[model samples]
Target: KPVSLSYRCPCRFFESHVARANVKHLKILNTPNCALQIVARLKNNNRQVCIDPKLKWIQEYLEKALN
Candidate 1:
């Protein structure tokens, strides 16, 4: 009985080790790409704010054209 139990104990240890590795891999793969998404969204917002009409709105305009 002692010899049989020793063999079974190793098997249980190996199974626990494998389950831990699988869970670690699952968490790594499931992580979201929020870093890239957030950077891209900010870049799009920056471009939207730099409109042609806004740039053309200088402090000195048609009045400074030697009237």
Candidate 2:
């Protein structure tokens, strides 16, 4: 079992963006639980990276992905 204090925050905002083709999944985390909020899980290695919600590309991508 993992230690309670070992639960590190998932978001890392420095990543900024991920290649659309390389993205396996996108997740938008909420406040009081997460720090950076928007994150992307990669296809090849399945690593989660942070994204800037304000970026125009992400905005369009979210709309396309949802609709």
Candidate 3:
């Protein structure tokens, strides 16, 4: 089969930023409980405990974080 390039949507236009910075890495967490969580795998330079994901900056954070 012929293959072509793949693409992903980038987050560029947004109206906000988060207090947290220097985060690198994104992971989707699945637990036996009944909730799915998105995690930022870093804190400045260390992989500290996962920070709050449900904060008001969720959308903007994810955009800049993942991209």
Candidate 4:
């Protein structure tokens, strides 16, 4: 079904650094169809981007957000 598809499936991740201040929202996509795991919505960029899930900054962000 078409509804089963994810809203966004990036072919690659952003290789540059993404500061937490620039991120408006964050989501982790584990679906097999996605090329990357971290989906980030920028505050001012008005575009959704993918980041490496293993990034140390991302890990810290999630840690603070979760607990």
Candidate 5:
């Protein structure tokens, strides 16, 4: 059986690490935008936040995607 893995966070650091490990079966989703969405949703829900500056980049990417 082939094992399936999903990476919910694919930040630059995570990408580098995965590349270094030669991981071929990994799927990196809309990492930064996903991060921003998650953060914004959390804030909306009044939860404690773990802020990541990289999320700004993600937001910008998402904005561009809309155009």
Candidate 6:
């Protein structure tokens, strides 16, 4: 279900940040089965934080992530 524009966008920002910060990617249980739950969390929490004009890239990343 991946979108054509998904790869074109900066969807890896969060993952890159995690790598740069030397933080491990979150190890969620049953990731493939929990896609909706993850999307819900991102839509609710991440999107709000991303809405700030100063966080334009965050907004882009979140949009692409959830779409």
Clashing residue pairs for model 5: none
Q: Where's the lowest-lDDT run of ten residues in candidate 4?
A: 4-13
Q: Which is the winner by TM-score between candidate 2 and candidate 6?
A: 2
All candidates: CA RMSD (Å): 27.6, 4.6, 13.0, 4.7, 14.4, 13.0
The C-alpha TM-scores of every prediction are 0.13, 0.53, 0.41, 0.57, 0.21, 0.22
Better model by TM-score: candidate 3 vs candidate 4:
4
Selected candidate, larger TM-score, 5 vs 6? 6
Residue-wise lDDT of candidate 2 within 22-65, one digit each (tens)?
Answer: 67887876556445467778787688878666556777976786
What local lDDT score does residue 13 receive in model 4, on the 0 to 100 scale? 52
| Model 4 Cα lDDT, one tens digit per residue, 1-67 | 4774455474365734776777788776656654446678887787888765556778787667658
Candidate 1 matches the true fold with a TM-score of 0.13
For candidate 1, the 10 contiguous residues with the lowest summed lDDT are 33-42
Model 3 ranges off by over 4 Å: 1-20, 61-67
Give per-residue CA lDDT, model 1, range 1-67, as digits (tens). Answer: 6655432212121121122112221111122322111101113222211111112322132235214
Worst 10 residues of 6 by lDDT: 36-45
Q: Rate the local accuracy (lDDT) of all candidates.
A: 0.20, 0.66, 0.48, 0.66, 0.33, 0.30
lDDT of 5 by residue, 24-53 (tens): 222223554355322221323333233333
**Candidate scoring better on lDDT of 3 and 5:** 3
Residue 44 error for model 3, in Å?
2.1
TM-score: model 5 vs. ground truth = 0.21
The ten-residue window of minimal lDDT in model 5 covers: 15-24
Worst 10 residues of 2 by lDDT: 5-14
Q: Which digits, one per residue and each the tens of the lDDT, describe model 6 over residues 1-67?
A: 5765432322222332222123212222133322321111132233311122124454565576548
Identify the runs in model 6 with alpha carbons over 4 angstroms from their true place: 1-54
